[PDB]
From TrEMBL, chain C:
This is Uncharacterized protein. It comes from the Eukaryota. GO terms for cellular component: cytoplasm.
TrEMBL record, chain D:
This is Uncharacterized protein. It comes from Leishmania major. It comes from the Eukaryota. The chain holds residues 81 to 117 of 118 of the full protein.
UniProtKB/TrEMBL annotation, chain E:
Belongs to the Iojap/RsfS family. The gene is L5213T.03. One of its GO terms (biological process) is negative regulation of translation. One of its GO terms (molecular function) is ribosomal large subunit binding. This is Uncharacterized protein L5213T.03. Signal peptide: none annotated.
From TrEMBL, chain F:
GO terms for cellular component: mitochondrial large ribosomal subunit. Keywords: Ribonucleoprotein, Ribosomal protein. GO terms for biological process: translation. GO terms for molecular function: large ribosomal subunit rRNA binding; structural constituent of ribosome. The lineage of its organism: Eukaryota, Discoba, Euglenozoa, Kinetoplastea, Metakinetoplastina. This is Putative ribosomal protein L14. Pfam families: Ribosomal_L14 (PF00238). Belongs to the universal ribosomal protein uL14 family. Signal peptide: none annotated. The keyword Ribosomal protein applies. Disulfide bonds join C46-C52.
RNA sequence: AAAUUAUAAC
RNA sequence: GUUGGGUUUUAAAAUCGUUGUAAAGCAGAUUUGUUUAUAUAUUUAAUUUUUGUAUAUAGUUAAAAAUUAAUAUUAGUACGCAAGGAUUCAUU
């Protein structure tokens, strides 16, 4: 039982019941915000939201562009995905082969 | 041959491996000037 | 051990050889060779081992500097019908150089033609001897 | 750049130099800024 | 048509003894090999570099040129291959009579009367060779 | 201490490929990367008109094939005529522009090929041939700008 | 791996004076350009300008927003700053679709327009279906999608596995493996997957149980001429002098003696698709695999390759969730010689000769 | 790649898969013919029982067959049964042929020129309306 | 280059594209074994952490000034240039890709301050064709009547950005008179205070424009007052530089020449003509000092 | 490998120069050596003081 | 042209 | 001062202790955390801007010279083929 291997046959079940406690400690706080003043600070957007990040286009110390990719997932879309039917594929999307030989910017 | 400069190990990760060979009256009992990882 | 080379997961160790008949394999390779003769790169053939042996070949063979026009005798006919296997193993005796070779018989740029008039089997026997001599007597011995 | 860059804060063209030392109670007030003095 | 344009180019830069041979349909791989007798190594490089440009605007395909080593410099137009040899080095090799003598490379060339005739070969050397058989 | 390696220099000039059921040469006749790049004194035949024996020319380098890229090998070759005329010497080291080989070398179009005898032509330090005329049929792999612009590109290729 | 690093940029250098666009501070109710002014004025530290109104932050920003409302086209590439892309809709840098389970059917040889000769392997994708989705406790990106294959009688599987397919209602499949999808790539359980899911040029990864060889020696497993050092840190003598050195006293882990030789899970991760037969549900790949015929091979996509995403702007973009057919598209109407979708040339030049 | 990931020289396994490929080093005899004589483990072959040599393997197989033509049963052991039920049908695929060569194809195999007649006498009239698998192979609950 | 036709790109121009799929070269593709878990098709989003994705369940990380949990401690720069709710990972775990659950909330963009709506503003089309130092380059890029000081006659809103040029020259870009007052009676008090004023004269007489440099005057006040400088501009306003204890010539020239750029841009806003500085006898005779 | 493990030819920590002779731990596993000042095989590699820099001359 | 090789290849 | 050439370590090993290698025969499902024999980054040829710089000519990038790999939740003492590669091709 390596040290870094006994630290995880112990803490992994704890790290579970920890973060799942925080998520619970959010619904209580978001529901309390719901009964509290609606339009207020209340530590960001209280209703199960992740404040969109505006600052993700940078120009690093070497004077070249650096983008920060950040994606969120609304639990409704990923839940509509898993029960509704996708759309018919456009005849031009499968009849046009994914061309080899990635063209340069020529 | 002539066994010089013994080393008394205390534990590990708390002795720094330069203090093992310390407790010997020498230029040791100082800080290693250029350590290697 | 620390490596576990074999893996016995139900996904891997399974085999789909029981339901293959639900897929018409040989019915496809026809409809896949048929596409090749519908394209330019093949013409239907029904040889019979005795029939092809010794019969002359025209070739052509594209290639960049110029096409290789070479005339030679067929000697194998690996497939005996129009399947994608093809193969000929001609002898082709171009010049002072002898060059036995294989033709996959589906290639666009490796085109040819066989004729069956002088391809009498009793001519194949001689060509077979002509090569052995050129083969055996070129060993730098 | 050359290393970790720290830009000291700046002001408008006109409000930059010789700012008025006009306070409210222990606070430097100005139409643009506020700062405990 | 294109082979004659190369002659209306080289012959301007004072190339001498220029000879074209429609080597097509014969044993070689190119179809029209030409030959030029320029004097200087530089005089071989110009005619090399000069025909390249003509192979840049009309027949735009001018993939490459080489750097140096222009004692006998060769410039192909793909199948109209131009040789540009020094004044010498032609009283050594063909310049003709290997392609002006080579028969029309026809069929039915299956060990004719002993092929050791080589008027293009016996013109330059002897070259013993033994015809074979199943013997 | 730790005799890490002896000769160590064949491994810089040979194409050594382990035999491990995946890395393996094969007889040719399977696909590109045929096999057996002909690595020893192999006594190639000369073909171009000189006093090279045209029947014997002993090999120098430990690699010869196009799936090994004869297109940049600088393959040295020593001349060992059993007789020349009783013009080269029987003791000089010329490069060689390999033409063909009896070993059945499969091409990248399935076109297997093998000739009656493995042959080649002697050439010079500037990659110019030493002969005037060539008496054999060369292989497609002699089309590189490496051995073209001085090679007569003798006659009918394969 | 050199030339595989993205543009380095730390976190201590993503401040106001580096953002490409106006750096936006958060203030609870709404964003703003100025730092939050602490309410308790006793918190305000010395020489800390609680800016109520800065012109430069407000001028440069004012021209910026007006120019985007008035000249959209020129300021197009600055419309993802304030209008972020929605969820789903196949983000190219983020979405990972699922693959499907194929069966090695046979082999053959194909030729492009050029004289090249490929060694094709026909993979049969019989009856794939998304049988269930799963997530590790609803954690992020830990999504999976299991895809069955080859409907089978109930008298085939053991009970404890057939009972699983009798849960999600899907037809009892022969086998089902799982692919880690992004939550935008989901599809309801039971979506009958077509083979056209793949496009005839993409680089597709496969995984299979290669052919069993039994128990082979070293000359066959790792057969070599000589080696076995990895001496590494252990000391040794060069340049004599102060010399006491240590040697091996155990067969260090990872030796190379005899063993099983190949019933493992092989993985080709760059194979480009060649010919999608969407009538017979066949895919041809121009490679020979060292697997027995009849194996199951899980197909994926090479998400990136050589440095460029597979489904990028230039080359095609996939049928993202999956490939859903039409309403009148009855494959049984057309012969197998019509439901074919070949590929572009994989080689730029005839490979018997050299590059022109 | 173009060469198969395994070359010509590699032994697969017993109970392995087919693993089809192009190869040119097979077919020693008139394979698949009523006397193929091939013996191995990969399915297209007969199970090679323990004999002292390939020749001595035939001699076993011959005298195991010409005891199934006198007494139409036999009690064989081990891998002789599968490679006899297979060979028992070959004799009967060879009985219906009846051509002037079959009896000279079967006189070479059996150690007995009498049984060949009994073989060619009964089996046409007896196995006429049976397609294949003419011999039964019952595994006894005993053991030597 | 070309018509983008991938066929007519090779067959015509021979632009050989790098083999993408079937090459024998590396085909740079890390993460094949080192990255366990879902990998997003973003190429190298995990290559600075050591090509792994294992950890990062942890919120805290060793952070230098400005990085992750350094947002509570005070530091002048990042206290005015970083939203505290924005501090991310540490120094090498920089987030090239972050995926979070939960709905997305976009706090609206900040609107503008002290702009009475329904006041159509005129706009300035800035161009690089302009000399980048012309006064039309420092005027606001949107001119609001709410920002035009009318109490003094000004057509456009005053500039808000000033050039960073450390001025070591003087000139009458829009000045009209630069007097100084000193005291010879002053002997001990402010030895350096006088040492600056006189020095600024000797460094003012060497001003930079074709005017006669005798726009500068030097008065001998017997008032025994600390030396004081008075600069008055064309339109008339006077600027009295602050002569504090410990300020030398090189400091004053930066003082006035800054307040002389604002005075110029105030005058250029008041309709006064522009005397544009240009190459005349002083960009020369200072080019020889090279 | 980030965890590291790229140890040198032996030395761990080397102390200050103190003129021509500089110390060094030479941690490896043992020693043997000699010594210009008193030449006796001296197992004690835990500390070897080299001369100007020649690993040939020690303690 | 010979009986040989080595072969640590079916 | 007499004086100096030598430098190196073994010849049938049931492994018989550790070692590592593979393995315990079907798991619907690689991979929250262990552990990395994993191993090269370049000697070449031929191009593309022989143009930059100098009297001769770079420097970058690509094509060509070879095989890719994931551990542990289900009932067991035949052949994992009833074998002659079809999960019974007709019945006996």
């Amino acid at each position: 039982d390596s040290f870094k291997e006994h630290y995880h046959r112990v803490h992994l079940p704890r790290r579970l019941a920890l973060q799942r406690y925080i998520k619970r400690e959010e619904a209580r706080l978001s529901r309390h915000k719901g009964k509290a003043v609606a339009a207020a600070a209340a530590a960001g957007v209280q209703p199960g939201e992740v404040a969109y990040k505006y600052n993700r286009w940078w120009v690093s110390n070497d004077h070249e562009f650096v983008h920060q990719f950040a994606f969120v997932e609304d639990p409704d879309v990923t839940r509509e995905k898993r029960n509704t039917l996708p759309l018919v594929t456009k005849e031009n999307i499968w009849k046009e082969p994914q061309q080899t030989f990635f063209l340069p910017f020529a | 041959a002539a066994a010089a400069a013994a080393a008394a190990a205390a534990a590990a990760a708390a002795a720094a491996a330069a203090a093992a060979a310390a407790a010997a009256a020498a230029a040791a009992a100082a800080a290693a000037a250029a350590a290697a990882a | 051990g620390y490596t576990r080379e074999r893996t016995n997961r139900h996904f891997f160790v399974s085999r789909a050889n029981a339901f293959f008949s639900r897929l018409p394999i040989s019915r496809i390779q026809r409809a896949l060779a048929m596409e090749a003769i519908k394209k330019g790169s093949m013409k239907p053939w029904k040889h019979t081992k005795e029939q092809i042996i010794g019969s002359p070949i025209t070739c052509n063979f594209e290639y960049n500097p110029r096409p290789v026009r070479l005339i030679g005798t067929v000697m194998d006919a690996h497939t005996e019908e129009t399947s994608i296997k093809g193969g000929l193993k001609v002898y082709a005796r171009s010049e002072e150089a002898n060059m036995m070779l294989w033709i996959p018989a589906g290639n666009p740029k490796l085109k040819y033609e066989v004729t069956a008039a002088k391809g009498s089997f009793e001519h194949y026997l001689d060509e077979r001897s002509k090569w052995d001599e050129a083969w055996l007597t070129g060993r730098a011995r | 750049f050359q290393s970790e860059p720290y830009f000291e804060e700046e002001i408008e063209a006109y409000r930059a130099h010789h700012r008025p030392d006009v306070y409210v109670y222990k606070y430097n007030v100005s139409p643009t800024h506020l700062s405990l003095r | 048509e294109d082979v004659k344009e190369i002659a209306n180019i080289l012959s301007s830069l004072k190339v001498r003894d220029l000879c074209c041979v429609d080597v097509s349909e014969k044993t070689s791989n190119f179809d029209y090999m030409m030959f030029g007798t320029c004097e200087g190594a530089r005089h071989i490089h110009l005619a090399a570099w000069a025909v390249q440009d003509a192979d840049k605007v009309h027949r735009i395909s001018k993939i490459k040129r080489q750097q140096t080593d222009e004692l006998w410099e060769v410039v192909p137009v793909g199948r109209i291959v131009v040789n540009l040899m020094v004044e010498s080095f032609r009283e050594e090799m063909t310049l003709e009579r290997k392609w002006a003598v080579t028969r029309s490379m026809d069929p039915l060339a299956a060990a004719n009367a002993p092929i050791s005739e080589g008027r293009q070969v016996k013109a330059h050397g002897l070259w013993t060779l033994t015809l074979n058989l199943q013997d | 201490g730790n005799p890490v390696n002896k000769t160590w220099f064949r491994h810089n000039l040979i194409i050594r490929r382990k035999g491990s059921y995946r890395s393996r040469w094969g007889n040719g006749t399977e696909g590109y990367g045929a096999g057996v790049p002909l690595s020893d004194q192999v006594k190639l035949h000369c073909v171009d008109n000189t006093n090279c024996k045209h029947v014997r020319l002993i090999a120098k380098a430990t690699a010869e094939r196009f799936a090994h890229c004869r297109v940049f090998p600088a393959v040295a070759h020593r001349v060992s005529v059993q007789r020349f005329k009783g013009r080269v010497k029987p003791g000089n080291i010329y490069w060689v522009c390999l033409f063909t080989r009896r070993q059945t070398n499969t091409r990248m179009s399935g076109l297997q090929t093998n000739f009656d005898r493995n042959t080649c032509i002697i050439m010079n330090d500037q990659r110019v041939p030493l002969g005037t005329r060539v008496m054999y049929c060369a292989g497609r792999h002699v089309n590189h700008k490496y051995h073209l612009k001085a090679v007569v590109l003798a006659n009918f290729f394969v | 791996w050199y030339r595989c690093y993205p543009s380095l940029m730390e976190e201590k250098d993503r401040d106001m004076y580096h953002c490409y666009y106006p750096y936006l501070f958060d203030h609870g109710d709404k964003m703003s350009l100025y730092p939050k002014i602490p309410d308790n004025p006793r918190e305000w530290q010395v020489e800390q300008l609680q800016t109520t109104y800065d012109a430069i932050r407000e001028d440069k920003y004012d021209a910026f927003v007006r120019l985007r409302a008035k000249f959209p086209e020129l300021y197009q590439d600055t419309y993802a700053w304030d209008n972020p892309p929605p969820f789903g809709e196949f983000n190219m840098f983020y979405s990972v679709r699922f693959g499907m389970i194929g069966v090695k059917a046979f082999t053959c040889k194909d030729y492009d327009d050029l004289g090249n000769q490929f060694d094709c392997t026909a993979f049969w994708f019989p009856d794939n279906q998304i049988v269930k989705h799963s997530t590790r406790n609803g954690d992020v990106g830990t999504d999976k999608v299991y895809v069955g294959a080859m409907n089978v009688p109930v008298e085939f599987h053991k009970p404890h596995v057939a009972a699983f397919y009798k849960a999600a209602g899907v037809p009892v499949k022969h086998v089902s493996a799982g692919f880690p999808v992004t939550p935008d790539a989901y599809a309801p359980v039971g979506t009958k997957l077509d083979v056209r899911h793949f496009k005839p040029g993409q680089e597709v990864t496969i995984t299979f149980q290669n052919t069993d060889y039994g128990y082979q020696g070293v000359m066959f497993r790792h057969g070599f001429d000589g080696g076995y050092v990895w001496l590494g840190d252990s000391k040794w003598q060069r340049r004599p002098g102060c010399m006491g050195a240590e040697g091996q006293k155990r067969i260090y882990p990872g030796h190379r003696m005899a063993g099983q030789t190949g019933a493992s899970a092989e993985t080709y991760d760059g194979v480009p698709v060649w010919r999608i037969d969407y009538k017979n549900s066949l895919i041809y790949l121009p490679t020979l695999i060292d697997a027995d015929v009849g194996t199951y091979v899980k197909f994926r996509d090479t998400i990136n390759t050589k440095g460029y995403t597979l489904w990028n702007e230039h080359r095609g973009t996939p049928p993202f969730p999956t490939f859903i057919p039409s309403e009148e598209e009855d494959l049984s109407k057309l012969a197998t010689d019509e439901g074919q979708l070949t590929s572009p040339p994989l080689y730029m030049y005839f490979r018997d000769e050299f590059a022109a | 790649g173009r060469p198969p990931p395994v070359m010509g020289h590699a032994k697969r396994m017993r109970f392995a898969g087919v693993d089809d490929n192009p190869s040119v080093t097979h077919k020693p005899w008139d394979t698949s013919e009523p006397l193929m004589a091939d013996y191995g483990w990969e399915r297209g072959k007969l199970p090679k029982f323990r004999a002292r040599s390939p020749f001595h393997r035939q001699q076993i197989a011959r005298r195991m067959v010409t005891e199934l033509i006198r007494k139409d049963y036999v009690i064989v052991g081990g891998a002789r049964a599968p490679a006899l039920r297979i060979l028992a049908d070959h004799v009967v695929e060879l009985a219906k042929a009846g051509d002037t060569d079959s009896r000279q194809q079967l006189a070479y195999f059996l150690h007995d020129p009498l049984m060949v007649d009994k073989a060619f006498d009964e089996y046409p009239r007896r196995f006429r309306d049976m397609n294949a698998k003419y011999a039964m192979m019952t595994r006894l609950k005993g053991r030597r | 280059p070309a018509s983008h036709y991938t066929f007519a790109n090779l067959k015509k121009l021979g632009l050989c594209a790098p083999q993408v799929a079937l090459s024998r070269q590396p085909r740079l593709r890390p993460h094949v074994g080192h990255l366990n878990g879902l990998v997003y098709p973003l190429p190298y989003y995990a290559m600075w952490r050591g090509n792994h994705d294992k950890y990062t369940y942890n919120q805290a990380t060793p952070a230098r000034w400005g990085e992750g949990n350094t947002n509570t401690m005070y530091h002048q720069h990042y206290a005015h240039a970083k939203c505290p709710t924005d501090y991310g990972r540490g120094g090498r775990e920089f987030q090239f890709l972050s995926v979070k659950r939960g709905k997305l909330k976009r706090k609206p963009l900040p609107t503008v301050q002290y702009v009475d709506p329904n006041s159509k503003p005129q706009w300035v089309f800035k161009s690089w064709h302009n000399p980048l130092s012309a006064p039309s380059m420092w005027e606001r890029e949107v001119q609001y009547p709410e920002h035009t000081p009318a109490h003094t006659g000004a057509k456009r809103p005053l500039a808000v950005v000033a050039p960073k040029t450390s001025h070591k020259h003087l000139f009458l870009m829009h000045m009209e008179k630069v007097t100084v007052t000193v005291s010879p009676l002053l002997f001990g008090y402010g030895h350096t205070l006088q040492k600056a004023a006189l020095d600024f004269y000797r460094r003012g007489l060497s001003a930079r424009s074709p005017f006669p440099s005798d726009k500068m005057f030097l008065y001998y006040s017997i008032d025994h007052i600390t030396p004081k400088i008075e600069v008055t501009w064309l339109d008339g306003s006077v600027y009295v530089p602050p002569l504090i204890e410990g300020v030398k010539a090189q400091d004053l020239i930066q003082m006035v020449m800054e307040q002389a750029w604002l005075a110029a841009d105030r005058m250029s806003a008041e309709g006064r003509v522009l005397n544009p500085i240009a190459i005349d006898d002083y960009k020369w005779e200072q080019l020889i000092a090279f | 490998a980030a965890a590291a493990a790229a140890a040198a030819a032996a030395a761990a920590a080397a102390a200050a120069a103190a003129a021509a002779a500089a110390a060094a731990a030479a941690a490896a596993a043992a020693a043997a050596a000699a010594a210009a000042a008193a030449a006796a095989a001296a197992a004690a590699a835990a500390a070897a003081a080299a001369a100007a820099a020649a690993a040939a001359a020690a303690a």
